[PDB]
């Protein structure tokens, strides 16, 4: 279960690495509609303090997440700047979060009568009174309850079905190294001359096999010229060789 429209779920993902490849094999084809950064460059171009919002709205308002488009939820529940960075991931929930009798736990607020600033959560429990008349009550004439309930019947058509969407936005707040991890693993010891990088030691040479004994706290090897000659691969624990071309 995800949080509703009026109070979106807050989760500040930080202190991790960069890996978003789990979305492709999670589900069949779905909507991405990425605008700021190209979708093929998410693994690289790391950011800091990703602002993640998770919530479910019907399919009518899924495509209204683009900046510059207003509406009923896109204007009064979640407002985006025109220079927005990042993009959302949306997918259907026809079998998981959709109740056969209609899920009514999801509620949304439409009456706020105020344009929202970007990136905040507002709570409006009070009831709005119209006609300049003191209402001070619930369910009366010229008084409207802002909260209204969703319906998740599976017999509904496309657009009225539940749609899980998670908003991902990337910002550089002076760019500290918080969430930035590549992988770039390639096990190839072919005894041919190669531009090798092991744990950040740039060099070119022919990688062969040796049997030198290294202490666990003793990684790099030197020589008389103070050059790296025998190294140890980071992923595994094997001393490669002392072999130039």
């Amino acid at each position, epitope marked *: 279960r995800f949080a509703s429209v009026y109070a979106w779920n807050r989760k500040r993902i930080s202190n991790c690495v960069a890996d978003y490849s789990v979305l492709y094999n999670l589900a069949p084809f779905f909507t991405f509609k990425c605008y700021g950064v190209s979708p093929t460059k998410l693994n690289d171009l790391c950011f800091t303090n990703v602002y993640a919002d998770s919530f479910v709205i019907r399919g*009518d308002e899924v495509r209204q997440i683009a900046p510059g488009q*207003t*509406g*009923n939820i896109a*204007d*009064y529940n979640y407002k985006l700047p025109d220079d927005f960075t990042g993009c959302v991931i949306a997918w259907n929930s026809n079998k998981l979060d959709s109740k056969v009798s209609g899920n009514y736990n999801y509620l949304y607020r*439409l009456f*706020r*009568k*105020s*344009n929202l600033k970007p990136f905040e959560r507002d709570i409006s429990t009070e009831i709005y009174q*119209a*006609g*300049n*008349k003191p209402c001070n009550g619930v369910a009366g004439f*010229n008084c*409207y309850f802002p909260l*209204r*309930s969703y*319906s998740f019947r599976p*017999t*509904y*058509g*496309v*657009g*009225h079905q539940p749609y899980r969407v998670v908003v991902l936005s990337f910002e550089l707040l002076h760019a500290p190294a918080t969430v930035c991890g590549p992988k770039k693993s390639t096990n190839l010891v072919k005894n041919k001359c190669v531009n090798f990088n092991f744990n950040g030691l740039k060099g070119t040479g022919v990688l062969t096999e040796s049997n030198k004994k290294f202490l666990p706290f003793q990684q790099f090897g030197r020589d008389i010229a103070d050059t790296t000659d025998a190294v140890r691969d980071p992923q595994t624990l094997e001393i490669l060789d002392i072999t130039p071309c």
Partner: antibody
Amino acid sequence: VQLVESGGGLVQPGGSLRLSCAASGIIVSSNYMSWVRQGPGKGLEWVSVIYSGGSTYYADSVKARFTISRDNSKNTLYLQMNSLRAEDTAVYYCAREVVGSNSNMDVWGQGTTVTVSS
Amino acid sequence: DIQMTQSPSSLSASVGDRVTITCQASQDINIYLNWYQQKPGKAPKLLIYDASNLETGVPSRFSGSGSGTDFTFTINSLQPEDIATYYCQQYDNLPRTFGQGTKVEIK
């Protein structure tokens, strides 16, 4: 809760005036209303819709023709027309959105019919 | 854009008898679909909310149901004071669209 017509008159093409729907206590600045179009013998048409946040939505046939003003406390909504090519021979209804998800308001409003000819 | 048309254009032969009016939508519609009841030259008056809710005081013989790009409305009491025109309108799907016309008349 009632509504008051304001407008009317016969004008040539190329001329326009201010059409007004006045409220009877309802605040007309920060609320959601709309204007729709009706002709004798033909179906309904939708002129425009205004929200509390300033969101103006209207049909593409009346693009760049209508501008709408909301009073702070005079309880009256104004509209000025532009580029009259004699297709406004109709009556306007000033109304409120019927229901978001659950409502039982049933109050409506009147308006004037205008004909445009040489 | 929603293009919607209805077969019962002129129900002028109904005098207190079974009435089967309907509206069909080009795309699939949810429950949210309503009607306007207006006299010729008069502002419409609401009678149906969200395809299932009714007014405060109206005759209770009215019935209706809508699912799968179609709403059906049936009335059995043809009272003389409610001679007017019935129109369909759909919301929550921008842009808003309105019906082309239904005629009901009692002899």
